[model samples]
Target chain A: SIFVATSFWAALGNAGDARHGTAKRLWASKPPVVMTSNHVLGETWTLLNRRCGHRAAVAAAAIRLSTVVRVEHVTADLEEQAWEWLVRHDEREYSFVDATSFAVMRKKGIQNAYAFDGDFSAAGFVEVRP
Target chain B: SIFVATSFWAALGNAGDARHGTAKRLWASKPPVVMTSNHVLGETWTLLNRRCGHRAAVAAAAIRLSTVVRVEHVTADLEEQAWEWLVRHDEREYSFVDATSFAVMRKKGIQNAYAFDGDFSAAGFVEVRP
Candidate 1:
């Protein structure tokens, strides 16, 4: 269960985006169970809508229609843990969804992240790269 | 528990939005426990950022800081139920976030929504009025 972040999801949708190839290549070369949170999906939708169009935004939700990505619901307890991480990293500005993704990865024992965000590098997970 | 949809959340952030007053009155009139999913927050963030600004988008996550709202994590099972509702209502166009909200409401025994969207009326939840 590689913890996929909003950046990866956004990359896949926004083809011209800088990391699109990185994301695209990763998905095709060797696909793994992409474990992500609904929070990531929500943020990804906004990112796509802001960059692309309404259609792209809607396409963001198509992950729900597939089986590769396991969209985990951020539980109350998990959200609390995410908050603790936020507080601990009070000096930095990791978004709430980022924190949620981190907490989710920690909880589920997912060690790798298919994310381009440097914030994840600051966290506990390793990056899945080529 | 009442499901507060993205429309209400967006209304609150975009002060002049037509439903702003309506949403405001409902929250203040008699605040009920707001049970919404991370999905709604994610969508609301996008809606706000698109309509308002970056800060407004971040504010959408403030519900996590509130006790009045119990942000439920949308479990895999619950998401499946939401998809079923989408499949059943294929003739209509309900966004994934909307379907998730409806499914969340149904799972938690919530019967009311703090929303201006008629979609809720089409679904099972009743709306709270000013």
Candidate 2:
């Protein structure tokens, strides 16, 4: 059974560190697959003290949460490949970043987002992996 | 009566520039207090072929679409005025740029937005002045 834990970022704060310790303990017991957004990681936890995970975990989450991950780092091919876009593309400041992620998740029948970024809330996806 | 002619940007590509000539004639009749985003200006128009307006107009819209204009160019004040923030502020990747604009507009009871930028739309403001 899919144990759906909806947006608990704000709620988690009031629930206290003891409750958090308890929840993490229970989480460890179940060993439930914990998937969450990098944005969320930025929030609920601080940069210096990350109890939830590390940057390596973040890199792994990008692949683990995604089934067939096509990791295309735009930085990797910016000069030779991205230049055509610089030449031909409409220079609108808007991005399809949200849509690109949605299409991938939706294709996998996963509408869940593990985000503390309010942008996720703005994009109409429900936070499920807190 | 305010003749709110909005979102005409999407349709001008139809019926030729001559048909658009007729609409522009009508828009000119009232001078209709026109406004919009830099995003829209970037779209339906190009960077160099700016028939609607220029970067100066954009700078103006940042004020004219607004009322009390406090132009705080960050570059001017980054060292002395902004450095305190660099010392004390939490480093978040996102910004409150939208909310800052909103509080200013809401202070004046001006809810309407004039934008060519869809980031305005993504931020949940109604786009007008096109």
Candidate 3:
């Protein structure tokens, strides 16, 4: 199963995003076994909400998000590893979401993710670009 | 133990927020057995990051946040409950973070929370005011 990062998910819901078309087209062609963490869901929802006032997309983000792929919980043990990775790669200045994504992907042995951020590639994970 | 919601956490980090003083004073006077979730952490971090370039607060939010209290993981079981709660209280239009906060607090039997949003009260969780 491929890890679905926040940037990829946000792009799907936000039509105004520069990457929206590509993200939708890519997912439509052939979807894979997808999984994301609550951290990702939280980020996606918040991103939509912030842009909601201006563009107003997906009022039922939480409800609609249920139809998405499996969501993994960011466990405490996993967060510990995420923090360690953040510290080790502090120079990269990866956001908290990036670190958690890396940790959980590593834990689940997921080598690829739908991420627009190049940091995914820097972290040694294949970025499924649109 | 008191649950720390994202709004409260964000207010503490952001001085411009109207409730920042209250959140800060309340936290300073008596540091309770505070607990938050990775979901909350994600929201807080993203909020800071979005506003980061504008105001330029803590560059290492993940690092400074370490000085804060215990953070709970939003387990899959807990997220299920959160979804149900969101469905049950759809009229309130609580954010995903709000629902997760309610779920984790209920799981931990935490009644009081440092939440600036009044939804905490609507969800039957006490709001810890400054």
Candidate 4:
């Protein structure tokens, strides 16, 4: 299983961004067991609407992403741990949302992702891009 | 010494920004130590120039901010690892510059920051405010 990030959706939504082709290829590949969080969905919606000027696409993407990943919720302890993870890397610029995702991944024993974000690599996880 | 993120300078440079007043207060308070990365300076320059449109003032502020906190460089290993940090998160939106800043801060043993970015807080670093 792989944790998905917001950048994946952003790349998928915006045709002008350099990651568009990469994202398309990843979608075509259709790896097994893709997972994502609510934060990714919200950020994706914001990015797609702000950058691409389309809400319907976001709505459809939201449904698609949920079906693909089966969006999971973080527990209280896990969320706190994620915050600690963020604090542990206090000198860097990793977001709380990323920390939560990392926490979920660690807990789920998942190690790979389909992401265009460098932060994923920075955190010691693998980005399975096509 | 505390590391300063691009958001800090962005806030300081743009009077219209909500953090402008907070940044001004921080400047007035005169913290004991201030530090920034080349990445921070670069990001700040681009942001200030693009958002504020005051080249002369921007240049002056750059010089002044440099005087307040010396800019530092990142080593090859640290830079590479910072990218890994980004990858580890893989699920969130963390910028390259922010990752570099974190890498530098971790290496330098700096724990605090003057930033309006949530990443800093999420990463477990303190954001010294006015």
Candidate 5:
């Protein structure tokens, strides 16, 4: 399963974003059985709503997108462990959501991510290695 | 500022839940500066939609209510540290999201929580201390 990130949505949805074309093409021909955590979606929703404007439209879009992908449900226990993995590194690259993604990824044995952020790579996971 | 938990939302959102009344009363008269991490919202959304069966409407409700509270954005490094705190203790009571809440609470110097779970109290934080 290929992991998707908030940046993927940021790039795909924003025409002015640098990776807009990349995101569009990626989504247009996305692989089946995609995996992502709700953490990413929450972040993406806030970003798109605040930065892109159009709450209802974007919210609708998110719901539709969620229908197709496997969103990994996060628990407080898993999140606690994810944070432990993130802070030990002391690296500036990983965000808490990123760490949570990694934690989820690790638990599910997911090795690849469809993301535009370097944090995924820095966390010892392959980024869009399709 | 006091942090809120997903359990708080679950309790508040579900009519049959035991803590529903407590949650409603808390929301009806909430504190001015209520803080919560996006992690909690993500978890809350899935629970509400899956268990309650009103994805779009509930999501809209979440967005509307989101305007009233300060949602803390989390990073990987911060989550990492929180996890470390959680596992180091080896206490089964703490959840990952709970640890993150504590992390955010400690960072912001907030000491109280609007929650129904005992994890907050077990973690040495106050639960609805009025």
Candidate 6:
């Protein structure tokens, strides 16, 4: 399943935070997978996005994202699944996501993110830069 | 020469910032090279460490670190030195440091650093994980 950091900052809601609401609801439904930092709190970041003003293309793409994949918080459950995937599946780099966005999503219970950042790839997340 | 991120956080001095004073003074004398971060401010970080309570082993290792190599802020002025060193040097990886520590050192004026963190080596800083 494809995942998005879905954080408001990376999403870049230049217009407003309302952009990510749909993505949030959708991700919450499936509880897919995302990477989060030990530095970030899941719900607190969510609330920040809800109130903070930033621009996010991903949030804007939310309309299309919903139809394409399942969404979920990258919580303990998903972390387990990721470990299993790593153990049994190919370690080839997968999709990528921004560090900030990726970290937030991981905390919220989402994995398999789409990003273009090099650090993630450097960290061993095979990146689909294209 | 080896450098330290030399940030205040990693260097814990409860008795007060006076702890790292010797190391700082020594590195300043040679202007050797340290890896400063694109994030940390040179003088600012120094000030913080002097006032903060974070713990840093490297700084504590200052006495020994001085005997071994040089130290300088990793500023734009020094980026080229690192790049040149990389091109002329082997890419087999070298010493490593914590991301936090690495960043600060890179920002200041230091270059070669000694660290044990996995991420630094993961980013390709060969490690002596012994």
Best by lDDT: 1
Candidate 3 chain B has its poorest 10 consecutive residues by lDDT at B52-61
The candidate scoring highest on TM-score is: 3
Model 1 off-target regions past 4 Å? A13-19, A29-34, A41-73, A87-93, A108-111, A117-130, B13-19, B31-34, B38-73, B87-95, B108-111, B117-129
- Which ten contiguous residues of candidate 6 chain A have the minimum total lDDT? A37-46
Q: Categorize the docking of model 6.
A: incorrect
Candidate 3 structure quality by residue, lDDT tens digits, A42-93 = 6676567566531232433463356657777777778777756655563554
For candidate 5, the per-residue lDDT at A75 reads 65
lDDT of 2 by residue, A1-130 (tens): 1122213332333344444544444444432343432223222222212333332223322332354323322121222222232233333321222323333344435555543345445545664332
Tens-digit lDDT track of model 6 for B54-99: 2222133232224443333233333333333332333333211133
Question: Which wins on DockQ, candidate 2 or candidate 3?
Answer: 3
Candidate 5: regions farther than 4 A off: A56-61, B1-130
- Cα deviation at B68, candidate 5, in Å, is 24
Deviation (Å) of B107 in candidate 4: 0.8
Runs off by more than 4 Å, candidate 2: A1-95, B1-130
Model 3 lDDT vs. the true structure? 0.72
Q: In terms of docking quality, how is candidate 1 classified?
A: incorrect
lDDT of 3 at B104: 89
What candidate 6 keeps of the native contacts, as a fraction, is: 0.00
Q: Which candidate is the best by DockQ?
A: 3
Clashes of each: 0, 11, 0, 26, 15, 70
The TM-score between candidate 2 and the true structure equals 0.22
How well is each residue in B75-96 modelled by candidate 2, as lDDT tens digits?
2122122222222333322122
Residue lDDT tens for model 1, A1-130: 5888888888888888998898899878655667788777766765776677666766776776668778887887887776566545644456667778888988888888888867788776787886
Worst 10-residue lDDT window for candidate 2 chain B reads: B73-82
TM-score of chain A of each: 0.93, 0.32, 0.86, 0.86, 0.87, 0.32
Q: Write the per-residue lDDT of candidate 4 for residues B70-106, one digit (tens) a residue.
A: 7775554665566457546634556656777888988
Ranking by DockQ: 3, 1, 5, 4, 6, 2
The better candidate by DockQ, 2 or 4, is 4
> Every model's DockQ, to 2 decimals?
0.14, 0.02, 0.27, 0.03, 0.04, 0.02
Clashes of 2: 11
- What is the DockQ score of candidate 6, to 2 decimals? 0.02
In model 4 chain B, the worst 10-residue window by lDDT is B56-65
